[PDB]
Structure 1
Amino acid sequence: IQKVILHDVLKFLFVYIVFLLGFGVALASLIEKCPKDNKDCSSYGSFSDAVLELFKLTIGLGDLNIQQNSKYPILFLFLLITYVILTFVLLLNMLIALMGETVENVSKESERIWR
């Protein structure tokens, strides 16, 4: 666990941040007027809400409907399906990067530094 939370996951965050914060603005700005007659107009409102409602998406949690008040419902989705794919690709770089670590190291690495 320790050699794994030092070497691979720390990378994955650092690139998972920049996309989340990156794509976060893109969908947090495409949203437009919140008519006060219809308050809590959209989940993606301020930037703080965009980061989380994307965060809930990654873990496999919540609900989604491509109707949120925006200027471009066609562009408002292309940046979202984007975030699904681009996120997903790294998660496959995750399991293989640890796969390329465990078959070489564990049986000799763990038992010895344990001693």
Structure 2
Amino acid sequence: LGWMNALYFTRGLKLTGTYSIMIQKILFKDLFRFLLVYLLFMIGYASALVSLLNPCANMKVCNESCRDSETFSTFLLDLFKLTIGMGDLEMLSSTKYPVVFIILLVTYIILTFVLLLNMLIALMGETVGQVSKESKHIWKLQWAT
């Protein structure tokens, strides 16, 4: 916590504290609400997938480490490991294991991992251009305080 508070002094010389402006928007509003809505999305879809193994018979083919179970939440752990935008999950053709599960999985992960974070990246790129006077102004405001 003290090395966090080290930011308190890091808002004076050398134009330090510019982050202290943008954290006013990203931590409280933008990244906050984004992580909320995305967490809700992914937990809902997690319930979906853990319910979508009985038809499209129980199989969650090994990732690119939960096996078929019913315990309480190990599903969520291994499934989140799967949701990691890590390795461009496998493609299918002439399905043998769960058939309609895979298409839902791929379209969902494309929705959430090719648009949502990109939505937020574009949001950053557009919102950063708001600093007009609050550079010298917050500088002398630091002076004052």
TM range (shorter): 0.5 to 0.7
Deviation digits for residues 76-108 of structure 1, max 9, x if unmatched?
212211231121211111111111110223x64
Q: Show structure 1 runs of 5+ residues with no match.
A: 35-39, 67-71
The alignment status of 1:75 with 2:91, answered yes or no, reads no
What is the DSSP-based 3-state SS (H/G/I as helix, E as strand, rest coil) of the residue aligned with 1:73?
A: coil
Please say if 1:57 is aligned against 2:77.
Answer: no
Q: Which amino acid aligns with 2:67?
A: S
- Listed one character per residue, the Cα deviations across residues 29-87 of structure 1 (whole Å, up to 9, x for unaligned) are 122487xxxxx87267556233333322344348x679xxxxx7112212211231121
Which residue of 73, 92, 101 maps to 2:127? Answer: 101
Higher gyration radius (CA):
2
SS of the counterpart of 1:103?
helix
CA contact (8 A) 2:50 2:75 kept: yes
Q: Distance in 2 between matches of 1:49 and 1:102?
A: 40
- Shift of the 100–45 alpha-carbon distance from structure 1 to 2, 3 Å rule, reads farther
How big is the alpha-carbon RMSD for the aligned residues of Structure 1 and Structure 2? 3.4
TM-score by length of 1: 0.65
1:16 alignment partner in structure 2: 38
- Please, what TM-score do these two structures have when normalized by structure 2? 0.54
Matched residues, number:
104
Structure 2: tracts of 5 or more residues without a match: 1-18, 59-64, 92-96
Partner of 1:69: none
Kindly indicate whether the alpha-carbon contact (under 8 Å) linking 1:24 and 1:51 is maintained by their aligned counterparts in 2: yes
Identity %: 42
Tell me which residue corresponds to 1:25: 47
TM superposition shift of 1:18: 1.8
Q: Distance in 2 between matches of 1:77 and 1:57?
A: 13
